[PDB]
Amino acid sequence: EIKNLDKALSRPERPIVAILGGAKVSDKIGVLNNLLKYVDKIIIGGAMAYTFLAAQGIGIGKSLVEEDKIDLAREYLKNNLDKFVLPIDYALAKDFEDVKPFYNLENTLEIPNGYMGLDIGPKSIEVFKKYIKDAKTILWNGPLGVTEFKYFKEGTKAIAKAITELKGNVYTVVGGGDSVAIIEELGFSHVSTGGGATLEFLE
Amino acid sequence: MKNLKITAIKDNLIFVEGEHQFSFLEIIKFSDKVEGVVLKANDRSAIVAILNEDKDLNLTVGSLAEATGELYKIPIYDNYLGSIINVLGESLVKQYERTNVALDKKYVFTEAQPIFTRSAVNEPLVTGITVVDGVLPVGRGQKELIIGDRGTGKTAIALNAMLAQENTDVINIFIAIGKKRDEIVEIYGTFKKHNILHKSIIVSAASDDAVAARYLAPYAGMAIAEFFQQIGKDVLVVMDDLTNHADAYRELSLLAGIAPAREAYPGDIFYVHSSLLERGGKYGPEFGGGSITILPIAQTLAGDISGYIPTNLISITDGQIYTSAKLFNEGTRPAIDVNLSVSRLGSAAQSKFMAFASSGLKKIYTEYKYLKRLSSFSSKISNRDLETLQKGKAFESLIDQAEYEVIDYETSAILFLLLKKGFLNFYTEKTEALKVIIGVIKVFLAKDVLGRKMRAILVEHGIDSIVWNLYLNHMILPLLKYHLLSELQYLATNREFIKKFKDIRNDGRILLAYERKGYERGIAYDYK
Amino acid sequence: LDPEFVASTYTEEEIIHNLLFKLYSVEQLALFTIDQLNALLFARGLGLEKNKVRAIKSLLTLQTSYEFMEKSQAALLPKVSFNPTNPLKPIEEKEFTIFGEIVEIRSQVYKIRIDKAEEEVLPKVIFYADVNGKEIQLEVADIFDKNLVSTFVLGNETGLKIGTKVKSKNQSYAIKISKRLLGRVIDPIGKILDDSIATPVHGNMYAPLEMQHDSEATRYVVSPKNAILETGIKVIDVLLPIPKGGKTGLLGGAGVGKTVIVQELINAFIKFHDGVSVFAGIGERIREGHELWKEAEALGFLNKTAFIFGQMNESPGLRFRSGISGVKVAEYFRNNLGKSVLLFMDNIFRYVQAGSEISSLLEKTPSAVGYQPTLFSEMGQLQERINSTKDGDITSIQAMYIPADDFTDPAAVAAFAHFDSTIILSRQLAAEGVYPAIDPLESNSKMLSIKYTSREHLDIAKKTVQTLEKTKTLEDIINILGFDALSEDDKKVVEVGRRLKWFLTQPFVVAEKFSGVPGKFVRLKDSLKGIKTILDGDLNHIPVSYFSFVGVVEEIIEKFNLDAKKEALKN
Numbered sequence A: 001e002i003k004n005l006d007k008a009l010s011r012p013e014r015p016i017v018a019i020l021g022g023a024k025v026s027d028k029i030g031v032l033n034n035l036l037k038y039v040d041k042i043i044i045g046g047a048m049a050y051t052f053l054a055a056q057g058i059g060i061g062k063s064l065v066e067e068d069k070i071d072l073a074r075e076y077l078k079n080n081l082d083k084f085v086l087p088i089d090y091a092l093a094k095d096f097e098d099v100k101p102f103y104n105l106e107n108t109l110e111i112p113n114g115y116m117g118l119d120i121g122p123k124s125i126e127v128f129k130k131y132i133k134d135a136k137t138i139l140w141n142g143p144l145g146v147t148e149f150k151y152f153k154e155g156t157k158a159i160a161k162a163i164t165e166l167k168g169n170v171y172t173v174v175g176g177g178d179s180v181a182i183i184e185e186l187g188f189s190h191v192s193t194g195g196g197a198t199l200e201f202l203e
Numbered sequence B: 001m002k003n004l005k006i007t008a009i010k011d012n013l014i015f016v017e018g019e020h021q022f023s024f025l026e027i028i029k030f031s032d033k034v035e036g037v038v039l040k041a042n043d044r045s046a047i048v049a050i051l052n053e054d055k056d057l058n059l060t061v062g063s064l065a066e067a068t069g070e071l072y073k074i075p076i077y078d079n080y081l082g083s084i085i086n087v088l089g090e091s092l093v094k095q096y097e098r099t100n101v102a103l104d105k106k107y108v109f110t111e112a113q114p115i116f117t118r119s120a121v122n123e124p125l126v127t128g129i130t131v132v133d134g135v136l137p138v139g140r141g142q143k144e145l146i147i148g149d150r151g152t153g154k155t156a157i158a159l160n161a162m163l164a165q166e167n168t169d170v171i172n173i174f175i176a177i178g179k180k181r182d183e184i185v186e187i188y189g190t191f192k193k194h195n196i197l198h199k200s201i202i203v204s205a206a207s208d209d210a211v212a213a214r215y216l217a218p219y220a221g222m223a224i225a226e227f228f229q230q231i232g233k234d235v236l237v238v239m240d241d242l243t244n245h246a247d248a249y250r251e252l253s254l255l256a257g258i259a260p261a262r263e264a265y266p267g268d269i270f271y272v273h274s275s276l277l278e279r280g281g282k283y284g285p286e287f288g289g290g291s292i293t294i295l296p297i298a299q300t301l302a303g304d305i306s307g308y309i310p311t312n313l314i315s316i317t318d319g320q321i322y323t324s325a326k327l328f329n330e331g332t333r334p335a336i337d338v339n340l341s342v343s344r345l346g347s348a349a350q351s352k353f354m355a356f357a358s359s360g361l362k363k364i365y366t367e368y369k370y371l372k373r374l375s376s377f378s379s380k381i382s383n384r385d386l387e388t389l390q391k392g393k394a395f396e397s398l399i400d401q402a403e404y405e406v407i408d409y410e411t412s413a414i415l416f417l418l419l420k421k422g423f424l425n426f427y428t429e430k431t432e433a434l435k436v437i438i439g440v441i442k443v444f445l446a447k448d449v450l451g452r453k454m455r456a457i458l459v460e461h462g463i464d465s466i467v468w469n470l471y472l473n474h475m476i477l478p479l480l481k482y483h484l485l486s487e488l489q490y491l492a493t494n495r496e497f498i499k500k501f502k503d504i505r506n507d508g509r510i511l512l513a514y515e516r517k518g519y520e521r522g523i524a525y526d527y528k
Numbered sequence C: 001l002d003p004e005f006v007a008s009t010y011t012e013e014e015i016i017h018n019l020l021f022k023l024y025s026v027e028q029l030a031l032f033t034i035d036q037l038n039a040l041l042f043a044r045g046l047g048l049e050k051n052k053v054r055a056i057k058s059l060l061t062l063q064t065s066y067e068f069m070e071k072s073q074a075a076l077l078p079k080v081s082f083n084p085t086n087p088l089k090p091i092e093e094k095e096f097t098i099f100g101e102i103v104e105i106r107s108q109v110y111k112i113r114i115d116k117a118e119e120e121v122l123p124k125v126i127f128y129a130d131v132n133g134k135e136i137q138l139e140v141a142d143i144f145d146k147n148l149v150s151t152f153v154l155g156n157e158t159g160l161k162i163g164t165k166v167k168s169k170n171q172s173y174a175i176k177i178s179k180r181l182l183g184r185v186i187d188p189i190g191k192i193l194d195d196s197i198a199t200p201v202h203g204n205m206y207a208p209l210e211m212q213h214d215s216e217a218t219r220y221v222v223s224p225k226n227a228i229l230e231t232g233i234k235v236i237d238v239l240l241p242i243p244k245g246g247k248t249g250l251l252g253g254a255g256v257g258k259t260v261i262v263q264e265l266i267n268a269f270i271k272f273h274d275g276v277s278v279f280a281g282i283g284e285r286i287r288e289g290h291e292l293w294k295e296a297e298a299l300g301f302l303n304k305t306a307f308i309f310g311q312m313n314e315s316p317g318l319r320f321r322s323g324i325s326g327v328k329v330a331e332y333f334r335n336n337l338g339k340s341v342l343l344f345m346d347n348i349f350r351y352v353q354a355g356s357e358i359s360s361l362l363e364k365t366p367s368a369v370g371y372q373p374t375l376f377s378e379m380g381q382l383q384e385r386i387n388s389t390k391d392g393d394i395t396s397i398q399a400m401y402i403p404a405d406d407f408t409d410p411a412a413v414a415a416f417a418h419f420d421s422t423i424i425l426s427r428q429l430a431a432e433g434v435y436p437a438i439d440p441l442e443s444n445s446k447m448l449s450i451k452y453t454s455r456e457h458l459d460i461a462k463k464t465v466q467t468l469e470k471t472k473t474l475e476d477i478i479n480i481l482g483f484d485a486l487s488e489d490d491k492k493v494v495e496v497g498r499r500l501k502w503f504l505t506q507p508f509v510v511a512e513k514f515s516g517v518p519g520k521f522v523r524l525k526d527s528l529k530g531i532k533t534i535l536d537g538d539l540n541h542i543p544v545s546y547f548s549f550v551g552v553v554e555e556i557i558e559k560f561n562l563d564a565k566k567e568a569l570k571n
């Protein structure tokens, strides 16, 4: 995966998109600092999006977030005003044991009291689909959702099907272990076997 | 046992006495071949209208009658297809012998199925008329009234809608109320000639027949249609016409003793017609899964759509096809008034390819007609106005088709796209060019191995503009150009004919070799 | 004080709803992605905006509104109970006290002879006949003597025969009403029309024919119309203002895109005004009713709309009772819950026709054109309960069919006696490709006056109407003589009028599934400013083709600048 990591980095087909799926913001901040200069549209998936929302004066409840990275994300938003994409619609469950999703009919951006988010919903799916179809190349490396149970894994499968159904000449990269598992289970132009290699390359 | 006896006979109505639990439209049996329905009833008396007649039976005062206690059911026999029958199921004309066992017995006065039993109307019903297919679409499950004056081609329009279903899974039911037997026999012969007899039924109630039979004819016909719909079939029903049905009901009510209303009709004429034209539509898979399309016909007097019955029918139906006497006198056939006509279903009732092909025809027709009317008063006409007059004349020539002529749906879509793209303007009031083009396209999309696949993709999928442009400019345009040049000779000298046709291949030699081999004019790409 | 104490009052649905009214500051608004801003704007019912600055300004302007700030402040304090004044009361509980049998039958009219009764029969009461495991309601019409009544069916008359036993409580027809009715489809007599199992509607029984007033004087405690309802549609907002608590007649249709008009209106009232909607479909086509129900489910305004469909195939009595049932549902939603209601009638002409049919069936001498003698009184009975009080406003949009375009028909005259505003849809404009196809010349509204609008709005509307009329007059000269046969002033007037005509076109939100272009919701001030700028000729250099189906004047200016710049860039 040396070619897919080097050629797609030195001479990427701009415009490009970044799909950073992860559990913590601090987890992939460096790639972001870099991606803040490599690309213009940035899709954030996982609890990093929840950290962004908590930085954005939005009720989240008790979803896990890097409170130390909250102020850093807010400052990044202040400096970079059109370099982030955040989900709007979610499929929420109070518990974690494969609970049926609860949908917010009105003012979906706000997480209610006592509720916590697990996966992005169909409207967020469409919002991200527009951006990925608009762009040229992708670096999918995150299960924006929770793969532990199917109640919060349909978002990652949906985004994977959307990216894999983009007919044309769209270049694709892989940088996530859970993304690798999702790709293997689904049945990318060249998905790196190990996401750690791409993570170190983009670090 | 005969528990009723006749006491008076006035105005062909039978007054019967006896103790019974009478119901509205209950069947009373006067013999094994004579029966009637109940109009009004006391606790011990009833008024009955007879449905048929017997030469041997002479109904008099004192005759005995039997009250069945149930409303009228029509039986379904296997030889209804390809036959002309009564409202009692007797075969007047037949092509196959009857098995003498009823498939089912269906109430003729059922209630229309409710809202939760329906499904969206989204599949075209191929009428076979270019203007109706393109500008006034009809879906499967729609109610499209055909309204106009006497002798303007409404029956021909309905007959064309039935003949266009030759190669289709749609069962035709033609109900004639108060029509002539000569016309009905002519329609039967037309069905036999065009090879739709094996799938078409005729329910006849001529003007000579009993008024109650002319009243019940549409109900029995649509009960048969509902029988066919219950097993997932698509049914197309024509009522010819509903004004005679309304007149028959008015006569029945006035003779029974019902108080007159506006235009001397009974007070429930609207409910009579509306309860009939609401049991037709598309139904969900668990409620039969089929559909019933209806094409009722209405006659107006001197183009007055303000009458009671025409107003009710316009209020009930999903759209109207107006036939104009003025347009008929101007040579237009079929004389369909596109301005007055409306179709509430719209594009939803078309295919995606046809919805794309016929996007902006209404504006073209409207401004063309306006400029045509004003052309007799102006002197200075703009270049844009001249160009739109030219395009409008082309469109008006396009939709002029002969009687009993079926033009296929994709052919109409292709002709619309050719009109909008400018390749239907070189001629000068010449029709043979359109006939040749239609024949070439029909044999291309029917008598071919690649044209068949192109027809299938046009039927099933909605393509974008780019691949359509490739389709037109790579196969349709060269073939059409060669055939037009071979048939129309002088067209080469036309500047506009060659200005638009310079960037199209010259397939003359291959197609000349094809036609020398004896192939039909328009087949191409014989890779078989 | 304590959010925890407050949360114990609001129900889960109530807090979820109150998440809408939470306010975001300008700094808070700034730190949003454009899709987040679009989602928040959509949730507040203001369409879509690609520009970030305009979207933020619109959200701030809506937030900086008296109603919005009141409802946001009330979202923090504990729940306040709406204590009703003059509420609707349920029907009295009774046993069946009158018993008789059918002695004369006809088409839709049945005569009942009372056998055993503990109390005297009252007019307009309902008899119940149970046949083949189904009940049939017969409304009393005339009482000939102590033991004989005439009745007409409410529904299907199949199965009624001489000797059928009927029992009555000596009460009018009643239906179950509650907040649970919101989101379901029923008919005038309460029967379920959206699932085979017929899941019951929970609520209290109410009689739609009983007004329940202390005295006649109570009917005169009514607020005269003073407010204007905003719709986000440029033509209606500018030239045809809609009264709040009044009546608006949507006269026209048929291929003019009327359906989109009623959908857009229901959606705008459900979202932008946070109101309740009642749709009473009188003489409703089964296909059109099914399609409207499915589209309401698909666009997400079903859950706040109550559907009462009197179908075309039912008896005249049920089609008559449809409007009364709708009015009763609206009255329940306003008097008992305090919520403003938008009542929809379709069609008024069919309600008049059903009344005429019933009157003719009961052997009453017809009036002019065969109509019923009590046509105007029936129209008053329907239309005088759509009023405005302290509890809330019931504003009604009524669609009428004019048969053969005869505005002198008695039904049209009777309806015009009550319409505070009229919106006339033109088939010619629909053919021309102008949507929403509302003719701004022959339509008018009584709220376009100094008592309700700013003088700026009045002058803008008058100038627009005069300009459009002059342009229409000059277009004939254009068609006959030519563009070079006019004066310079007339040329300028023609160009300004063409720009004004094409600016009033608008793409609707509920239609973006088909058009594929996002719909718009133009606020009144923005449309007023756009028309003011267009009237001044400040955009006469732009070709008219850029004015078709746009949101605001700023969009026209930006698109023209973009196109021209890019043109020059290539050059």
Ligand SMILES: Nc1ncnc2c1ncn2[C@@H]1O[C@H](COP(=O)(O)OP(=O)(O)OP(=O)(O)O)[C@@H](O)[C@H]1O
Residues within 6 Å of the ligand: B149, B150, B151, B152, B153, B154, B155, B156, B157, B333, B334, B401, B402, B403, B404
């Ligand atoms: N497309 C057509 N091209 C040529 N002739 C036509 C066409 N359509 C109808 N006609 C002719 O017009 C005449 C009247 O047609 P048709 O019988 O359908 O009219 P109608 O409106 O049903 O009349 P009626 O009131 O007598 O029942 C016939 O002579 C028929 O052949």
Ligand SMILES: Nc1ncnc2c1ncn2[C@@H]1O[C@H](COP(=O)(O)OP(=O)(O)O)[C@@H](O)[C@H]1O
Residues within 6 Å of the ligand: B343, B344, B345, B346, B347, C252, C253, C254, C255, C256, C257, C258, C259, C260, C435
């Ligand atoms: N923007 C549009 N462009 C073209 N056609 C439209 C548009 N909007 C609506 N229509 C069509 O106009 C027709 C109007 O009929 P409808 O909305 O049912 O009103 P009515 O009930 O008065 O006939 C619809 O069937 C619809 O297909």
Ligand SMILES: [Mg+2]
Residues within 6 Å of the ligand: B154, B155, B240
């Ligand atoms: Mg005829």
Ligand SMILES: [Mg+2]
Residues within 6 Å of the ligand: C253, C288
């Ligand atoms: Mg309608």
